[model samples]
Target chain A: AKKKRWNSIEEKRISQENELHAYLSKLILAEKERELDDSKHDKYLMDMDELFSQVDEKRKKREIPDYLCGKISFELMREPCITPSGITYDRKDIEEHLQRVGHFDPVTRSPLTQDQLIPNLAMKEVIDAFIQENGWVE
Target chain B: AKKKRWNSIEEKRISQENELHAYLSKLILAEKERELDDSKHDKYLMDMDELFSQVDEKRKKREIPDYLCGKISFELMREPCITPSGITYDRKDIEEHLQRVGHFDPVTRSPLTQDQLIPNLAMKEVIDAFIQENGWVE
Candidate 1:
């Protein structure tokens, strides 16, 4: 009984160590982005706190066309991605909805996934053209 | 002189025929989408447009987070994507040129295509939150 007890404790210790390793790996990977000085992707850490004051205050505004924004983000779709179900959204909003909340289309709760994203070039063009014609809110 | 004249007319005929075929191809391809309105992918489009309008009006205005704007469009990218050459644009503007105009990088004019687009998730995330957090400009 004593020998078996020792084996059981050793197995538990090994399992806990594996879990610890897995967790640390995630932590380091997450921080790897922070460490990247030239990363434009996360460059907002290069920061945006006051960026809006420039965007909003300097530029003139317009009544946005109803179709330009995403259902999830509700902002203009810069890079619209189409769903397998044919709905469109900004990549970030749809992605977060898929990863964290439901892993399904938020509008319909229909089955959806990241892999299903298709660049909606037509919509992107329409939105881009709209902004270009309007010249970025000014 | 007579033979040369016949050849010139024949060349003109061939060019015009080619133009007609190309125009027909575009018309057919463009209508391919409309024909699919009842199909599963497009089935929910009507549902989504209403959703889009309702949500779009909420984030009415903001400064042009100029850095987050697509290089080609100069509009806030809804889903910024990168080229293999590493310059970024919202998928639409880059895709528009690649499909309809020059299939080349805007910065380098390097040979490029739609296949080269890589989603700029970092930019998209920053812009998404920028709207979410700022909401109609402080």
Candidate 2:
């Protein structure tokens, strides 16, 4: 049997994705811990894993794209397109684009506020684009 | 009589542009208000829009681009490229990359300190390469 070499692009993609996930997870946990520490006298801050699991659960339902989540590269980020309305966009513009677009669930057409949409868009586009482009599992 | 309607992409672009316009106008007004507010109070929380506009002005003049400023897309946020020196960057990675590349002003090719170049990539290669690839600029 021959040892297989992993694709560098694939390796880079996965590595970056893992890094981002770890970074975000640690950030969320750290924030939770800080809140707990601050309210130590009040007994308010809850289980960290419980918060983590909730994020995972929401992630499953939301299906955030990879491109918004910092999983992809600069080349794909720059693909130039002019909307029929004469507005042009590259990758970095998507967050604001999504922000302005104002969050209608394509399936249900239910409206969402910017507060709910912005954070989700932050993670969703990055993750979705990366996974789709790389053919990685969702 | 005949009529045409915008598809989602066209509608999206218009909305995004409108949103951008609204964002810009909001900043202008907010800054005016902040200036008035600041005269009356110390340790005032600066208006985010005002801060954003100031940063945006600086970035544009210096040829440093940003996503949140509506200069590029979310995709540009993901593409991490390894420099010739093995430095990697997403859209926002230039500040650190500039540090590694050291400081040489493009206009004169004279040596600038790391501190001097920290404001923007004084080198044309660094700034232009980022802009050319990322698109969404003037």
Candidate 3:
């Protein structure tokens, strides 16, 4: 289970996520982005299996209906909840959205708090029915 | 219940989140960030109540432990899951990590897909009790 490790001092290697972080950090502070030795970053998502998993393969292996997915993570909805703006999201995702991103409803910039999450029993029933009919187990 | 609204063509104003989005977009294509007349971005977190509610106010109100928070959002943990390398992140964040960020374990670059998210029920009880006694800080 041993793989190579590199530190920030090792001739400036970085990841794509870090590249996003580093570049934005420069703009946030109005600085410059220096070049990095990000050679291995290309190894991230190159597998044919990974590549094939994008569009129709996604539909072929078939996770159906964008409406049934979590807005941020795109995972099938497990527990759906309605925010104050009447938009629904997976409780799993909306919870993270407020804590990590910001405390606004994804649909509207209106005030929203954890207290505002209302469990959508009807929506849950629909999702549960869909899973059952498709012979898909979650 | 009426509030002001703005559009993209209205002299190019934006939010702090959009500012981050806009600036990063510039670098991804190797472009430049232009200054906007983003006056209302200042209104996001003002008010002495909000101001007084930071720092010592945080500890004085006392959420008690940072260990209890979701790593990305910093909210108290709801459903904690163990990633491949034995590090635990809230299930809420882990799904986003794979969907939004690159696909890898948070602690190691080893293959980590959605199915690997084994729920850490042991930590959940501890976090549940923490909330039961002291409650969520925010």
TM-score of each: 0.30, 0.17, 0.28
The CAPRI classification for model 3 reads as: incorrect
Write model 3 residue lDDT over B13-131, tens digit each, in one string. Answer: 22432443333344433422133511222221132123223422543555345655665657666886655454567786889988899689766677888776655543465566556
Ten-residue stretch with the least lDDT total in model 1 chain B:
B41-50
- Each candidate's interface RMSD: 27.4, 22.1, 18.7
How many pairs in model 2 have backbone atoms within 3 A of each other, for residues 3 or more apart or on separate chains, i.e. clashes? 32
Q: Relative to the unseen true structure, what is the C-alpha lDDT of residue A30 in candidate 1, on a scale of 0 to 100?
A: 45
For model 1 chain A, give the 10-residue run with minimal summed lDDT: A44-53
| CAPRI category for model 2 | incorrect
lDDT score, candidate 2, position A109: 45
Q: What local lDDT score does residue B138 receive in model 3, on the 0 to 100 scale?
A: 33
The second chain of candidate 1 has a TM-score of: 0.52
Is candidate 1 or 3 superior in DockQ?
3
Q: Encode model 1's per-residue lDDT on B1-138: one tens digit a residue.
A: 244554466567446434433433333333446556544323233332333344345434455656667777887777677664556687878899798888898886889888767665544655676666553332
Worst 10 residues of 3 chain A by lDDT: A40-49
Q: Fnat of each prediction?
A: 0.00, 0.00, 0.02
User: In terms of TM-score, how similar is model 3 to the real structure?
Assistant: 0.28
